Ligand binder design. Structure first.
Ligand code: Q7L
Ligand code: Q7L
Lengths: 412, 412
C-alpha cells in the first residue's frame, strides 16, 4: 500500500552553474546563462547562441579513460547523479543495493556522438565508426553507467518523452518507491543537443528564438515579443527515498513529493492546444494524487518555453485548474534564465521547485517586459519574490502532446 | 490491492511476416527471417545480412504525406499499434479516451532519418535539414502520433532501455492499469537500426555474427558455433486492459499478465555476468510480483541473442531460479528465427509467449545443432514442441545490465 516519497539529495549541471547551489544563486539573482555558442561555428545557422555548461570538468567525476567513451549528455547525467547521491549521504551496501535503482532520461541522447560517427562513416567508411558508438550514445547509459559505478541493482530504466522527460522520470521513479519496487531511486534527466543536427533540426522547424544580437533577452516567456525557445544543456538528478527509510538513517529531507500527473493532449505532434486542455487534465491528475485543494498551490514552475502557443496555453490551463486562485499563486519560468534543457528541463526545474520550498522564494521570470494578451497572473516579472510556499508544482509539456506535473510540499 | 491486467489485442511487423498470424506461422514452422540486406552497398561492412521487414505497405495505415514525415521505426510502431487496437475490438469514446494511454518504446529510434539529415547537413549545410527531422525521429513519436490519431488522452510515454525496451514498456504499462491510472494501454516497441550507422556501430563492437555465407544459420542461441547476434527490424504492440473493463465489453482475452520484474546487473556496459545473477534476481522479482513459485513456470521465451556470454548467463540464471524444475520447463529463443529486434525484441517475444499459451506449444530454437558446454536444458532444439503451458516467462537483458521479465498465465 502506497508509501510516502521525499527528496534527500539533488545534483545539477546548468548554464548558470556546475552544481545546485551555484545554479540557484544565479536563479535568485535573475542571471542569464545564455550566450553565443563557442564550441562550434554557427554562421550558416539561423540561431547561434544557447545555454552552454561552462567549464565542466569531467575529471571531478570520471577517469579521462571512461569519459572519452561517453557522449556529453551521459557525462552531464553522471555528474548530476554523483552530486545527488553524495548530497543524500546514502551508503550503498549488500543489504540495500537491490532496493536502489535509477531512472535518468534524455530527449535526444548522444546526438553529438551520432553526428561525429556519421561524419566518419560518410568521409572514411564504416571501419572508422567507434567501437563505443552505441553504448556511448544511447539514452539508457546514464542509468547503466551509474548502476555499474555505484553497484545499484534496483529498477534500471530510462524514459524519453522529449521536453517532458525529466518530469516523467522523477514521477515514475516516485511510483517505483511508493508501491514497493524500490526504497531509493536516482531520477532526472540530461541533455547536450548543441550540435549541427540539434541547432539545425530545431532551426529547420522555426522553433528557436533567432535573437542572435541579444541572446540574454531571447528567452522571454509570456512577453509579447517572444520568438521561440533557447536550446540549453545540462542535467538534474534527485535522490528520491521512502520516508521511513529516510527517517531510519537520519537523512536530511528537502521536501516531500506528494503528487504526479500524466496526460496526452492527443492534439498535434509539436503544437499544444491553445486552451491547454491536456495540461489542465495533467495538473488536476497531480493535485488529486496529492489529495490537495488547488488553493494550497503557492508556486508553479511553468514549462514556460518562450514559444507563442506554449506560453499562452499554460496561462489558459492554470486559469482553468485554479479559477480565481490563479490570481493568488506565483508562476514563473526559470527558462527565462536557463533556456530550455529539453529532457533535462523537468529535472533542473523539479530541483528549483524544491529550493523555492526550502528558501520561501518564487524565482523570477526575467525579460517579461510586456506581458502578452491574457498573461495577467503573477508571473514574478524581473525579480525573485520572497513569499509563503507550502506546495510547489512543476509542469512539463513535450512533442507528441505528452504532459507531466510534479507536486512537492514542505516536510515537517 | 491491485487490478488484474489481460491482453485483448496484438500487432506485429517482423522478419517473418507483416502481422501476428503470419509471424507466428513462421515461428511454429522453424522458418528464418534472416537474409542479405538489399538496396544498400555493404561491401565495406563485416556483416551484410539481418532480419528485414519485407513488403511493408505504410499506406495501409498512413497517407503518403504523413509517412514521409516519420522514420521507419515510427511507421513500424504505428503499424503494430493500429493492428493491436483493431484486434482488441476496443471502441474509443469521449467517456473512455482519458483512460487509454500509450507506451511504445525504441532502443535507438530514428537512426535512418539521422543519417539522411546528416548527409543534407554535411553536403548542403543546416538549411537543408527537414523541418520534420526532430518530431519525425525522436523515440516518443510512436506514443505521440498514435495518441493524436486515435484521440488517446491517458498516460503517454516512451521507454528506451536498449534490448530490454519492449519488456519494460509492457510491464510498466501493466502497472499504469493495475494501479488505476489507465484502463487500457497500447504498449510494446519498434526498431529500424539497419542503416550504415546501425550495422556499422554494432559491427565496430564486433557484437554481430559475420556468417555472411549462411545468414539463416547465423542466429544459433546456445550452439557451440555462435558468433554474436543478428540485427533485425520490426515492431510489437499489445493492448493491455483491466480485467473487469475487458469482461464488461465482451473482449476476447488472449492471456493474463500476472508478473513484471526488473533488476540491474550493475556489472558491465555491454556483457552480462557469467552466472546471470542479475537475470536471476529479475526472474525471482517477476515470480514474486505474480505470487508464483518457480515450479509453476512451464515455458520461457529466452532473451537468447546468440552471443557467447549472453546465452550461457541465461542457462546459469534459469538453473539458479528453478533448481529441480529447470529441466521440466521448456526454454527457447525465437531470435534463432527472427534475429534480434533490439527495443522491439521484448514486444514480439511477449506476443510469442502469449501465443505459446493460446496454442499450447513451445516455439523452437532453430540452428541448435551442437548445444554448448552446460546448455543441457530443454531448449526445444530444431522443431516446435506441443506441451502443457499454464505459465510463460519472457526475458530481456540489455546494454547497461538492465533486465526485465514478464509473467503471462492462461486466462479462464
Ligand atoms: C532528433 C532525433 C534524435 C534522435 C533520434 C533517435 C535517437 C536519438 C536522437 O538518440 C537516440 O536515438 N535526436 N534528434
Ligand atoms: C510502477 C508504476 C506504478 C503506477 C503507475 C500509475 C499510477 C500509480 C502507480 O499510482 C497512480 O497512477 N506503480 N508501479
Amino acid at each position: 500500500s502506497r508509501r510516502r516519497v521525499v527528496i534527500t539529495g539533488m545534483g545539477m549541471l546548468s548554464p548558470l552553474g556546475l552544481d545546485v547551489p551555484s545554479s540557484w544563486e544565479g536563479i535568485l539573482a535573475g542571471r542569464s546563462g545564455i550566450a553565443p555558442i563557442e564550441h562550434m561555428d554557427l554562421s550558416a545557422y539561423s540561431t547561434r547562441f544557447g545555454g552552454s555548461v561552462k567549464g565542466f570538468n569531467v575529471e571531478e567525476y570520471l577517469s579521462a579513460k571512461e569519459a572519452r567513451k561517453l557522449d556529453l549528455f551521459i557525462q552531464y547525467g553522471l555528474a548530476a547523479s554523483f552530486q545527488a547521491v553524495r548530497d543524500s549521504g546514502l551508503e550503498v551496501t549488500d543489504a540495500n543495493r537491490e532496493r536502489i535503482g535509477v531512472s535518468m532520461g534524455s530527449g535526444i541522447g548522444g546526438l553529438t556522438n551520432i553526428e561525429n560517427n556519421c561524419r566518419s562513416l560518410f568521409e572514411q567508411g564504416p571501419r572508422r565508426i567507434s567501437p563505443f558508438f552505441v553504448p556511448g550514445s544511447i539514452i539508457n547509459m546514464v542509468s547503466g553507467f551509474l548502476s555499474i559505478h555505484l553497484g545499484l541493482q534496483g529498477p534500471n530504466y530510462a524514459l524519453t518523452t522529449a521536453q517532458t522527460t525529466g518530469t516523467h522520470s522523477i514521477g515514475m521513479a516516485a511510483r517505483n518507491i511508493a508501491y514497493g519496487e524500490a526504497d531509493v531511486m536516482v531520477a532526472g534527466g540530461s541533455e547536450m543537443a548543441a550540435c549541427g543536427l540539434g541547432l539545425g533540426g530545431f532551426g529547420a522547424a522555426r522553433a528557436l528564438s533567432t535573437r542572435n544580437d541579444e541572446p540574454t533577452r531571447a528567452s522571454r516567456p509570456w512577453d509579447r515579443d517572444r520568438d521561440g525557445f533557447v536550446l540549453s544543456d545540462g542535467s538534474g538528478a534527485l535522490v528520491l527515498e521512502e520516508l521511513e527509510h529516510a527517517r531510519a538513517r537520519g537523512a536530511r529531507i528537502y521536501a516531500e513529493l506528494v503528487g504526479f500527473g500524466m496526460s496526452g493532449d492527443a492534439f498535434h505532434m509539436t503544437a499544444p492546444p491553445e486552451d491547454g486542455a491536456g495540461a489542465a487534465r495533467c495538473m488536476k491528475n497531480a493535485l488529486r494524487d496529492a489529495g490537495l485543494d488547488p488553493r494550497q498551490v503557492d508556486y508553479i514552475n511553468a514549462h514556460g518555453t518562450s514559444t507563442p502557443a506554449g506560453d499562452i496555453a499554460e496561462i489558459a490551463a492554470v486559469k482553468s485548474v485554479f479559477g480565481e486562485h490563479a490570481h493568488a499563486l506565483s508562476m514563473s519560468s526559470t527558462k527565462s534564465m536557463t533556456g530550455h534543457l529539453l529532457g533535462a528541463a523537468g529535472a533542473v526545474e523539479a530541483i528549483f521547485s524544491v529550493l523555492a520550498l526550502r528558501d520561501q522564494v518564487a524565482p523570477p521570470t526575467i525579460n517579461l517586459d510586456n506581458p502578452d494578451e491574457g498573461c495577467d497572473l503573477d508571473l514574478v516579472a524581473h525579480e525573485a519574490k520572497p513569499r509563503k510556499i507550502d506546495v510547489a508544482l512543476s509542469n512539463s509539456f513535450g512533442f507528441g502532446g505528452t504532459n507531466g506535473t510534479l507536486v512537492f510540499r514542505r516536510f515537517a
